[PDB]
């Protein structure tokens, strides 16, 4: 009844391969979407900042990205997190507004019927 | 000089690496004993392997 780690060099490479096979399809677009900056909730860690789950419905409205055009361009949404204070909101608009400033969406061809 | 750096300067390709130093400053200990710093003060020598 043990847990032996002889595969540990192998899961590293299998993860490494499957992280390169993820990028094969998405060759021009990142392997993971942008995550917000949210402060940890305990008294211990409330001065730290780390990546969370997604951008709220009003972090995203204030940046110009609707909740429907959000997950197309790779922006996670968290329908559960809410912006209690401005600082939680002003820090994360500058996550989106830099992301939209650095991102180039390729256009598409439409289906307007002719004649 | 950027992988190991120096003895008092950080190697650039390694965070917080300084090359070690020595417990003996001169790497050659049978050539201090024969110096002028030691053989001026030492007491009068005895002989080699003594007579029986």
């Amino acid at each position: 009844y043990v847990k032996t780690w002889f595969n540990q060099p192998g899961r590293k490479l299998r993860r490494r391969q499957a992280r390169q096979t993820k990028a094969a399809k998405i060759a021009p677009r990142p392997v993971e979407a942008i995550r917000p900056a949210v402060k940890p909730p305990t008294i211990r860690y409330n001065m730290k900042v780390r990546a969370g789950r997604g951008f709220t419905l009003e972090e995203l409205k204030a940046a110009g990205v609707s909740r429907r055009v959000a997950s197309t361009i790779g922006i996670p949404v968290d329908h559960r997190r809410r912006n209690r204070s401005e600082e939680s909101l002003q820090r994360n608009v500058e996550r989106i507004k830099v992301y939209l400033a650095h991102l180039i969406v390729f256009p598409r061809k439409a289906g307007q019927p002719k004649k | 000089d950027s992988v190991f750096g120096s003895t008092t300067e950080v190697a650039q390709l390694k965070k917080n690496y300084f090359l070690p130093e020595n417990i003996i400053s001169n790497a050659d200990v049978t050539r201090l004993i024969n110096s002028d710093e030691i053989q001026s003060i030492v007491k009068a020598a005895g002989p080699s392997r003594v007579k029986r």
Binding site: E86, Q90, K97, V98, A101, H102 | -
Partner: peptide, 25 residues
């Protein structure tokens, strides 16, 4: 060996111009 809320909800960062000419392609 290598050698404040009114101005953020309105102003955006620039186009972040393109280097190495393939992201400019």
């Amino acid at each position: 060996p290598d050698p404040t809320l009114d101005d953020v909800l309105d102003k955006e960062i620039s186009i972040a111009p393109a280097k190495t000419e393939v992201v400019r392609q």
